[PDB]
Amino acid sequence: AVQHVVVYHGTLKIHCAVKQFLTEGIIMKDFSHPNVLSLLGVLPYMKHGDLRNFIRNETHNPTVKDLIGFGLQVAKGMKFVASKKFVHRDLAARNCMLDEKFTVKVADFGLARLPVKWMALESLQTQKFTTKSDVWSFGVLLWELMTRGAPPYPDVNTFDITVYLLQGRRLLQPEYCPDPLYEVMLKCWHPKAEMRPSFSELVSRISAIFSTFIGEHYVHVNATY
Ligand SMILES: O=C(NCCN1CCOCC1)Nc1nc2ccc(Sc3nnc4ccc(-c5ccc(F)cc5)nn34)cc2s1
């Protein structure tokens, strides 16, 4: 069963990277989606590396369309993962990768595997993780995308985040976030887990927002981040 399955550089020609083991080898191996990082048999090399570092790179010139497009690809990847009944537990821009085609692959799962500032409130309180808690995390990722990789809740110390949130607070709208995309993030952070959108609903809502843009709005980095 692990026979059909059979960090450092490598070749096969495909360029590659290399970092119970056999069981999860098989499990990781059957997750095939273009917005999900593959097991080659050893993972494909991602030319552009992590999503967070890429958007922070002061020499890159992402547009609003570009950033929303990355968020759309994450959502497609998570829609697939969620269909397989798998919970990520650590969705963050740091855990998403970008290839030579600028295709986003959700990574940091399986063999490649507390992120308190990305955690839903019920997970901060129960230490249990669901698909609905991934959705909350996804909303924080979108906020990362729109601020070009700013750290969330900058003046909040990890520990005190649950108290902060329980005062009635959320991340503020980034300067280059469209209003409808901020409403989407607010939905992802709905206080009741069951009221949060599914990943299928997020793919749908975000693809419509994405289609309204034409690549004319350059997103700049914030000085206070
Ligand atoms: O590094 C490059 N590309 C060059 C990047 N440069 C930088 C300077 O600008 C020019 C472009 N390709 C790579 N592919 C792969 C393929 C697999 C893996 S392991 C893995 N599995 N899940 C995850 C999830 C996240 C992270 C991660 C997090 C933070 C980081 F910082 C780097 C990697 N790793 N990870 C590593 C790499 S790294």
Annotated binding site for ATP, which residues? 7, 19
Q: Which residues are catalytic?
A: 90
The CATH number covering residue 56 comes to: 1.10.510.10
Going from the C-alpha of 16 to that of each of 2, 12, 106, the distances in angstroms are: 20, 7, 17
Contact 206, 49 (CB under 8 A): no
Contact 35, 73 (CB under 8 A): yes
Query: How many angstroms does the Cα of residue 49 sit away from the middle of ligand 1?
Result: 4
Among protein residues, the one whose CA lies closest to atom 7 of ligand 1: 49
Indicate the top mutation candidate among 28, 90, 91, 97 to test ligand 1's pocket, ranked by most ligand atoms within 8 A of CB. 97
Residues with CB under 6 A from ligand 1: 7, 17, 19, 43, 45-50, 53, 94-95, 97, 107-108, 112
Report resolution in angstroms. Answer: 2.1
Among protein residues, the one whose CA lies closest to atom 10 of ligand 1: 48
Contact 49, 25 (CB under 8 A): no
Specify the experimental method: X-ray
Residue (of 220, 209, 196, 2) closest to 111 by Cα position:
2
Q: What are the backbone dihedrals phi and psi of residue 71, each rounded to the nearest 5 degrees, phi first?
A: -65, -40
Among protein residues, the one whose CA lies closest to atom 11 of ligand 1: 48
Going from the C-alpha of 136 to that of each of 16, 32, 43, 215, the distances in angstroms are: 32, 24, 27, 27
Contact 219, 60 (CB under 8 A): no
Locate the ligand 1 atom nearest the alpha carbon of residue 45 and give its number: 14
Locate the ligand 1 atom nearest the alpha carbon of residue 46 and give its number: 14
Range of the domain at 78: 46-225
